[PDB]
């Protein structure tokens, strides 16, 4: 696997504008809300959840770099696995999108696999 | 179990005010105080035990992020389980709570379970 | 133990005005000193000591809040218990307190055990 | 191996000016491009894997290093091996360059191998 | 040992002006450099490496404590221990001098051994 595969899907020219830690089912998680830098369109919503999904693994370094994206507030590529949790209460108040990477979009072009 | 649950207590549009961390019974523990961002009612306490309550998996998180919130002073919905610690000093120094969730809060919305 | 035991002493509205880092006999270790905020009184001085006394799981979360409450000069309750380093030459140029917890400090109470 | 082995490459005084994290092959990862001071020449690009190469133990510091520098802007010497990373979605969105090593730079030469 | 022991060396009022990251042989290392606060003296120039040398427990505590100082600015006092790095090349591009320590410094004194 990797955050690049053509099965994943990303969002460019976003920010970080929510951010939430919790527990579920034994794992710590977090989800972010992100919108379109510019205001239009719809936000997108990711969670990542330690020890669940084959993303588990990056689950410290995505939750660290949320954390700095979100305090900058900069431009950012969201990338994503889609239909990975199934809790549906959960989905229904964040989503079932995987968070799988996170890029800067910094005054040229956002650096991740496109 | 989930931050979540119905079974579990939150307060929207608050800041954190106090934090503190020390040890109990070989456990590292921090506590919050948080109160609501217009200063109305009556504050919320809650603590986070390394290695006690069915909580303990997400306490590093929960720390880094309580310490986060604490450092910007933004608006959070704070969530806690009522009625977990039980050593009588302890409940009446801070309270009962057991922390389990932090929620960014926008002046419309708060991110997370409601 | 808890470190809020009346066994314990502690020093209210006090600023951490010093830091170090070193080692001791295979441990990593760190000194604070701390004064009144309102300049009154002696010098408080406490130190952690990775994996020595009954205190060491709490050294990394003690280390990290030092260090935020020094980077902040805001005012802190400093918990310690007497009477734990015997290092003669350690003791002497810092103090046998071992640190056990730090609270933060509204205008009328400290947050933290008393 | 060593940061300073003459079979490296370094580029002197450059800003990083991108920064992505992801995962491939169950390793969290990071990739940076850096940009001299100065604005001529080329963009480096140079990845971290955390489960790959000799350079693996290191991931950690340099992940950490890197955020830094990233967010201070200064001007630093990025240390390579050319020709590690080999999976070619990922060479050819990224580049095969290991980083293996970060340098501040004083106003007049960078502390680090040359 | 202890950072305070007699064969070791410190040197007072100095800035940490420079970073670096590194790995050799397997292991991660930084160095740092300061120079007097007044601009007067000789440069110090210590490193740390992560297995190596009696001081390798402190490698993270001192790696965090150096990042500290250094994005402060604020004067310290660095403590070493002499001739402890023999590769050639490694110390012909730092020094010999394992970082042992780093305390703050007042105006007036620094709060470490002496
Ligand atoms: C640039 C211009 O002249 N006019 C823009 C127009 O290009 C906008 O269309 C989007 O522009 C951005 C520029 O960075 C992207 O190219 C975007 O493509 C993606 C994206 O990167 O966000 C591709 C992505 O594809 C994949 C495989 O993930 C799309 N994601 C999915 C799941 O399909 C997303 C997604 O559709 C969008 O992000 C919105 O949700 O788009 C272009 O679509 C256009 C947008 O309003 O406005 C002009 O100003
Ligand atoms: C409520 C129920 O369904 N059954 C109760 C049960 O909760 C009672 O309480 C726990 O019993 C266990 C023994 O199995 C423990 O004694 C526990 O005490 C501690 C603990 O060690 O876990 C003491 C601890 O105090 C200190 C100084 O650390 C408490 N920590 C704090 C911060 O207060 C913890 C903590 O409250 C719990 O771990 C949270 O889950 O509890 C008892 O609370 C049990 C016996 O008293 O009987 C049942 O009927
Ligand atoms: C070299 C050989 O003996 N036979 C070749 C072989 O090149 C092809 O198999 C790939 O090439 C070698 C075999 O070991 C590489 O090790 C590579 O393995 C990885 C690895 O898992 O370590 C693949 C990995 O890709 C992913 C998606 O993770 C690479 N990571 C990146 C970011 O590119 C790493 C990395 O490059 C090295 O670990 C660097 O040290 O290598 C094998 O997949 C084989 C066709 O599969 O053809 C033979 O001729
Ligand atoms: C203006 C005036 O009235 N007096 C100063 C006078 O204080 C100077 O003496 C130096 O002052 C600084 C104050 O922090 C230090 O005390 C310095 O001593 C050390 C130091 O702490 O840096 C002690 C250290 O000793 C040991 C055993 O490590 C010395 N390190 C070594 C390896 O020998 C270092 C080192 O020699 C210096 O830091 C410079 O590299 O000094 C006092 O020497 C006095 C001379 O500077 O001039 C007056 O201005
Ligand atoms: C009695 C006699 O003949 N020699 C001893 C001897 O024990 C000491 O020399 C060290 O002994 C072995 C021989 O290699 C060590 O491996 C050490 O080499 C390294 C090491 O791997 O630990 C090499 C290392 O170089 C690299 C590229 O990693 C050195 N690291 C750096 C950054 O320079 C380290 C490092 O210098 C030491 O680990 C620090 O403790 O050493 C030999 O140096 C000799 C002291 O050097 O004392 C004699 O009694």
Redesign the pocket.
Known sequence: EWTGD?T???????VISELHVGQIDTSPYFCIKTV?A?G???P?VACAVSKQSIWAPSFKELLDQARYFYSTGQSV?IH?Q?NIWTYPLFVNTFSANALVGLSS?SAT??FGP?
Do not use: L, M
């Not at 994943?8 to 976003?14: F, I, K, L, R, V």
């Open positions: 053509n994943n899907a990303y969002y460019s020219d976003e379109k510019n239009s369109g719809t997108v590529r994503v889609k979009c072009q956002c496109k």
